[model samples]
Target: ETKLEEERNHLEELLEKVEEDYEGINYDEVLEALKLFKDNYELPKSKIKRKIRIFLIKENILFLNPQKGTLKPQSYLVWNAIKRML
Candidate 1:
């Protein structure tokens, strides 16, 4: 589906943006980063944030906060992207 591919590519770019910030990023603050690299779509902001949250979880990345609102990607890349966080 065209829509699905668009979403996938958006998420891919989103992750790249996060990696660019490797210092740690807030959950709801990613919107600012998106604006720096891409245009915002018509989707609701909450929906986009939820999509990012779920995508990171499925990717098995580490979260610095117990609420999973903070992303800390220190060791995720060096291990060949298989995810090292427990």
Candidate 2:
């Protein structure tokens, strides 16, 4: 159980980084990468959604009409967060 938790945490961190870098990225690249990870992990949609929700909430970012690919606030906070390392 502890191993599973650690793996899940690591994956969640990776997912957040991916999503952060996704801003202004080629949709095809993002889709392809996400698909590859999805295939490898075979995680349930519920688990993925939960992680995404937690990431967004923790960062106070909002995905407006995510199904339609809209991001609210337009601050690009996630991207800014990632860019700070550079």
Candidate 3:
């Protein structure tokens, strides 16, 4: 798998682990952990940002202002994954 794929998988696993470990996992903490994980994996910010956006869109999680752009399949996958948890 590509680095992005690997990092995405790692993030997914980390999130799952966090949820399993705590009675109530903090979203901000998870976000911070994801950022640190991305940095540790040396993933590009652009790629990580794109993935985040994609995930958001797929999950149908609304923000104050909707992002204006197209997203890839993987982005939708991530979005749906997170949305399902919420």
Candidate 4:
């Protein structure tokens, strides 16, 4: 009872952050980046999924194909996870 309510509160806090990140994104830029990543790379599914877990899945920047390493961005969200620029 109390434990369940506490857990829901914790989940809501996390969900609030996810909603914030996706709310003010430039979808055009995000989708373009997704297209390039898919087109330019022939990388492993593991690698792709690892990256996806951050921006798209956990951050709620986009919709990830939960069952596989797919580049199908659900809607639009990205750019902030740009620490890998090299």
Candidate 5:
């Protein structure tokens, strides 16, 4: 039971790290907008780029009709919150 508890805790810690605003996103090249918007988060290039795209459409940043025929953050208060850390 003790070993199981320790293992569970370790797994939980790993999951917590994964939940980082950086983890799944951790980028190779520098994210310029992120620099202006956020200072200390990380993201993978292509996937996070997709996420940003989704954000634009969701908040209707670029277009405001039928959208891009698809769907996602244009916010200072949010960069204010470091992309909401989700």
Candidate 6:
């Protein structure tokens, strides 16, 4: 519980920092940021599974698509790799 909160604080800060970049805040850089954190493996896998995707959307870092919407082939590939890590 305590550990999760502390790590989440860092994660929030890390993304907030990236938001300052304000260029192309897509999944590629987001995934890269996630990979940089070794704490990811230490965190609960269940939490990672659900929260990560939602958090990405919550932050307005769009990458996914539905049939009605357009899609990026690379984004799916990146998405696969990102989720595969969890």
Task: Report how far off residue 71 is in candidate 5 (Å).
Answer: 35
Candidate 4 structure quality by residue, lDDT tens digits, 1-86: 46444434443444455446656444444444444544433223344435433554554434445466444433312222221220
Residue 41 local lDDT, model 6: 26
Please provide TM-scores, in order, for all candidate models, with all chains considered together.
Answer: 0.28, 0.29, 0.29, 0.28, 0.26, 0.30
lDDT of each: 0.40, 0.40, 0.43, 0.41, 0.36, 0.43
lDDT, residue 78, candidate 6: 35
Cα lDDT tens digits for candidate 6, 1-86: 46444444544564666567635455455655456333332222233334454555454433335443422222333333334452
In candidate 1, which residue ranges exceed 4 Å CA deviation?
26-86
- Residues 1-86 of candidate 2: C-alpha lDDT, one tens digit per residue: 46444444544565556567756344344334334332332223333344554444354433344455433321333333223322
Going through the candidates in order, what is the number of backbone clashes in each? 0, 0, 1, 1, 10, 0
Q: Which ten residues in a row have the lowest lDDT in candidate 1?
A: 77-86
Compute the lDDT of residue 28 as modeled in candidate 3: 59
What tens-digit string does per-residue lDDT give for candidate 1 at 19-59?
67535655345544233222322223243355554555444
Off by over 4 Å in 2: 21-86
TM-score order of candidates, top first: 6, 3, 2, 1, 4, 5
Instruction: For each candidate in turn, give its C-alpha RMSD to the true structure in angstroms.
Output: 14.0, 14.0, 12.4, 12.6, 12.2, 13.2
Clashing pairs in 1: none
Worst 10 residues of 5 by lDDT: 63-72
**lDDT (Cα) of model 6:** 0.43
* Clashing pairs in model 6, backbone N/Cα/C closer than 3 A: none
Look at candidate 5 and tell me the lDDT of residue 17.
Answer: 47
